[PDB]
């Protein structure tokens, strides 16, 4: 679910 990376992605960054 690619788009869903950046909520992961957001966390550090």
Same mark, same amino acid.
């Given at each position: 679910? #690619?788009? !869903?990376?950046?909520?992961?992605?957001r966390q #550090? !960054?």
């Amino acid at each position: 679910a #690619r788009h !869903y990376k950046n909520l992961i992605e957001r966390q #550090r !960054y």
